[PDB]
């Protein structure tokens, strides 16, 4: 495999330091300039740092100079990114990438799968799960929506199933959003025949592995 | 400062259409340009360099024309694996690299208005001190849609967050949730909670509402 493999990501607190590594295999690492490119959740790619094949001439985007150091150990075919003081805005997947030696525009022709860095002061916490109850205006012979609100957990991810996976048609589990509290929230919804409300039982199965939390929440029409 | 901007931000096309993305970039080192492709949850990959001249594994239906500060990428006869986000990229003598903001190419299909649903907060959550009010826009196309929260007909701002699914693999629609967050105390000050929706599939706005307690 001709590849790059990043490691060292995880949750870190603002103000702390961090070191990312990138292991190269399958090509002559010491012949290539190398780069770090990051991608904040839901945002575009941002180049952050570059270095010559010989480990000299490390250079940075303005917002990270003096905080980030890119470096390499050619004897171990490894690239490093040291961050000496983390900021909330450093949350991103960090990719290492190889530069083509033969093109005069700096061109990144090989990428790793990336490593996620989550900068946060939040502690690990399992979610509270609340029903999104099907409306009483739900019309006989039509379709109703119901769901679960999975609120205030950290870190990602949660998983959600309905009726232990028996219900998959019509399920939409939304991407989590980061709340102003620094905790995540998401909803899972499903549309069902309105005739099944009075008859069938609906339960969302929520699992949050980082806190070893499991919740099965019944969703019923409300009183 | 250095700016690299792409237009449009998003576009839809049918399998077989012809697509063109524009890149406007602060003048760089070489007047060439690079394009990358990224699919959701996946790493970016190099698509094409306007500096290249060998053939490469590029399936050739991609063309990168331009020079200076103005470039384009064209996809003749779009294929299913081409639906993705595309980034242009310039390099500079500082040195530095700079990526454009990206252009998402999604799957065109017939316009479908959202099915709208509003959910009141649970009594369980209220006892904990917070009211989440949730508005669901289900199975719509195109992506562009506006949710407006109204509380006793007063338009809300700054107190909601939205999330949207990726385009559905089977019917090419989107779904969207908007969540209004109030304290228990603020929630209890008002009666009528309403989500009002506009979308290309709707010729006038759709409102779903409930009265607190009913």
């Amino acid at each position: 495999q001709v590849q790059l493999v990043e490691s060292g990501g995880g949750v870190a607190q603002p103000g702390r330091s961090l070191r990312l590594s990138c292991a190269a295999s399958g090509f002559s690492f010491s012949r290539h300039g190398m780069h770090w490119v990051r991608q904040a959740p839901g945002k575009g790619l941002e180049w952050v740092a570059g270095i010559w094949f010989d480990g000299t001439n490390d250079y940075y985007t303005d917002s990270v100079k003096g905080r980030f150091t890119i470096s390499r150990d050619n004897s171990r075919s490894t690239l490093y990114l040291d961050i000496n003081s983390l900021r909330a805005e450093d949350t991103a997947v960090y990719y290492c990438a190889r530069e083509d030696p033969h093109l005069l525009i700096a061109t990144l022709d090989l990428w790793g799968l990336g490593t996620l860095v989550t900068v946060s002061s939040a502690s690990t916490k399992g979610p509270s799960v609340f029903p999104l109850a099907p409306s009483s205006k739900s019309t006989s012979g039509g379709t109703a929506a119901l769901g679960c609100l999975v609120k205030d957990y950290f870190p990602e991810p949660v998983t959600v199933s309905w009726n232990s996976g028996a219900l998959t048609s019509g399920v939409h589990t939304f991407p989590a959003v980061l709340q102003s509290s620094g905790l995540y929230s998401l909803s899972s919804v499903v549309t069902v025949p309105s005739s099944s409300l009075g008859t069938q039982t609906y339960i969302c199965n929520v699992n949050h592995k980082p806190s070893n939390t499991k919740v099965d929440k019944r969703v019923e029409p409300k009183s | 400062d250095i700016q690299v901007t792409q237009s449009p931000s998003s576009l839809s096309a049918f399998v077989g259409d012809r697509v063109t993305i524009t890149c406007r970039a602060s003048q760089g080192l070489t007047s060439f340009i690079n394009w990358y492709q990224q699919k959701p949850g996946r790493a970016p990959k190099l698509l094409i360099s306007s500096a290249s001249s060998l053939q490469r594994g590029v399936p050739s239906r991609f063309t990168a024309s331009g020079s200076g500060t103005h470039f384009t990428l064209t996809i003749s006869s779009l294929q299913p694996e081409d639906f993705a986000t595309y980034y242009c990229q310039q390099s500079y003598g500082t040195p530095a690299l700079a990526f454009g903001g990206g252009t998402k190419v999604d799957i065109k299909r017939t316009v479908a208005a959202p099915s709208v649903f509003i959910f009141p907060p649970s009594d369980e959550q209220l006892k904990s001190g917070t009211a989440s009010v949730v508005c669901l826009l289900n199975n719509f196309y195109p992506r562009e849609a506006k949710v407006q929260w109204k509380v006793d007909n007063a338009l809300q701002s700054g107190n909601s967050q939205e999330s949207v699914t990726e385009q559905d693999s089977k019917d090419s629609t989107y779904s969207l949730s908007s969540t209004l967050t109030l304290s228990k105390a603020d929630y209890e000050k008002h009666k009528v909670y309403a989500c009002e929706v506009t979308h290309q599939g709707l010729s006038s706005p759709v409102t779903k509402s409930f009265n607190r307690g009913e």
Partner: peptide, 10 residues
């Protein structure tokens, strides 16, 4: 000459 980005030959 030398590429400013990677130090390689032009």
């Amino acid at each position: 000459s030398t590429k400013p980005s990677d130090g390689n030959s032009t």
